[PDB]
């Protein structure tokens, strides 16, 4: 039965916001089992509150927040949760006073800045959020979540060149996960330029050697190579090696979809052959 | 210029399964739109996956004599309805091969019992005016809590064993 606890913990660990199941299991486990659980419920309240905000209810929010208040009176985290409550109901300046206060009584506190920025972004404004986030990063380096958010924001502003610099800062450290290299390759391939596609195939490869079961990296390599084999600016040797790259990748994709098939094979073979 | 019940169904379903992220999908006709596809959610300013999805859906729709003729986006923020560059590019590319395809953006500020159709017609995807049982179907199936088995293309890239056509929903709405 305790499985519910471990599933909640899982969703806490690998952030998996869906805020439909969470609130259910929370309200189930917010009951008498609380006294059974023992000194562990508080995190479950901090986790159910946010998912509830995500579901629209807002009724369970104050119950969880007031439990938190009564246990931890002079806290800071519950203050952040009150700021969240405010900004959901669209009291922005109040929340700003709050965050500036608990930064004023604690300058080396990050969460207040990272909520001020969420507010600045929820208004619609981006360009000032970016410089605020950089002025933050100008002090609190080693904030990987921030680097990834910055990369996403530069992407949605259609500046694909500095997002790559952030991804460099972010896959230099923790260089054992495919996702970062893959997203770097997608950035570059989108950026255009042969000098970049030569990197796109490289990193779509390295991101495959690691996992060796990813699929997006595979199609990425296939498309990068196939497009190299038509750009009339490279010596023959380039094109002849990219042809074999693409053909081998095609064979491997054939293997994969064959495993899958136990009608798709038709369409994928068409895609293969048409070039 | 007709709205198919199942199209709107899959459309708003995808909009609801990932309700805090911007999504796009894709309508396929043989103007009557005949089937929706949920393909992506996330950032969406990135070519390769999009390019291969378009290619594969072409290779597959030829078999059944269908052409795409239709796009739709739904931003993450509710209070926004504006055809960001990306969708404009994708619809100008689709109308290079159809020259009658229409763009859709769901208002999403009502999201209960919405459409904002544009049209190029030599203009930069300008607006038009509103042109039921499918509404009831939508409401019922939504409250049926069934969106959790609706597969998009982004899921297909992880677990190949899915089926982006998801005929289960098709037959399901057929029974209604």
């Amino acid at each position: 039965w305790e499985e519910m606890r471990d599933k909640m913990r899982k969703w806490r660990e690998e952030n998996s916001r869906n805020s439909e199941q969470i609130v259910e299991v929370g309200e189930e486990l917010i009951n008498e089992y609380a006294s059974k659980l023992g000194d562990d419920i508080w995190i479950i309240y901090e986790q159910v509150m946010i998912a509830a905000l995500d579901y629209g209810r807002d009724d369970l929010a104050l119950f969880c927040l007031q439990e938190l208040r009564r246990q931890f009176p002079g806290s800071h985290r519950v203050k952040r949760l009150t700021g969240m409550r405010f900004e959901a109901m669209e009291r922005y300046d109040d929340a700003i006073q709050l965050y500036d206060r608990i930064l004023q009584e604690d300058p080396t506190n990050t969460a207040a800045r990272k909520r001020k920025i969420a507010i600045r972004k929820a208004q619609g404004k981006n360009v000032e959020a970016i410089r605020e986030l950089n002025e933050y990063l100008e002090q609190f380096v080693g904030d990987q979540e921030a680097w990834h958010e910055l990369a996403e924001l530069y992407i949605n502003e259609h500046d694909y060149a500095k997002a790559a610099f952030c991804l460099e800062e972010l896959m230099m450290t923790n260089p054992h996960n495919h996702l970062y290299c893959q997203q770097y390759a997608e950035v570059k391939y989108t950026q255009g330029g042969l000098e970049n596609l030569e990197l796109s195939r490289k990193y779509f490869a390295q991101a495959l050697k690691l996992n060796n079961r990813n699929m997006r990296a595979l199609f990425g390599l296939y498309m990068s190579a196939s497009h190299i084999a038509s750009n009339p600016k490279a010596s023959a040797k380039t094109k002849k090696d990219n042809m074999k790259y693409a053909s081998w990748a095609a064979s491997q994709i054939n293997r994969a979809y064959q495993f899958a098939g136990r009608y798709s094979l038709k369409a994928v073979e068409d895609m293969l052959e048409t070039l | 210029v007709k709205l198919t019940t199942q199209a709107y169904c899959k459309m708003v379903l995808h909009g609801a399964k990932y309700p805090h992220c911007a999504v796009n999908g894709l309508l396929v006709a043989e103007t009557l739109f005949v089937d929706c596809i949920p393909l992506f959610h996330g950032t969406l300013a990135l070519a390769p996956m999009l390019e291969v999805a378009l290619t594969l859906i072409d290779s597959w729709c030829k078999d059944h004599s269908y052409v795409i003729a239709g796009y739709y986006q739904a931003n993450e923020r509710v209070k926004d309805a504006s055809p960001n560059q990306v969708a404009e590019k994708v619809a100008s590319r689709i109308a290079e091969g159809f020259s009658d395809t229409a763009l859709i953006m769901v208002d999403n500020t009502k999201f209960t019992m919405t459409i904002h159709v544009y049209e190029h017609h030599e203009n930069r995807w300008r607006c038009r005016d509103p042109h039921p049982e499918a509404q009831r179907i939508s409401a019922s199936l939504l409250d049926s809590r069934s969106y959790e088995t609706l597969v998009d293309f982004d899921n297909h890239l992880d677990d190949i064993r899915n089926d982006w056509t998801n005929p289960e929903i098709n037959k399901a709405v057929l029974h209604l």
């Binding site: 380096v141 500095k162 800062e169 038509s230 | 999009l50 378009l54 590019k89």
Partner: peptide, 20 residues
């Protein structure tokens, strides 16, 4: 012939100068 070819188009420690 690739039918669907798309073209879409201060951070501390970033310069563009092709430094050797």
């Amino acid at each position: 012939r690739f039918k669907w070819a798309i073209e879409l188009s201060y951070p501390v420690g970033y310069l563009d100068k092709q430094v050797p």
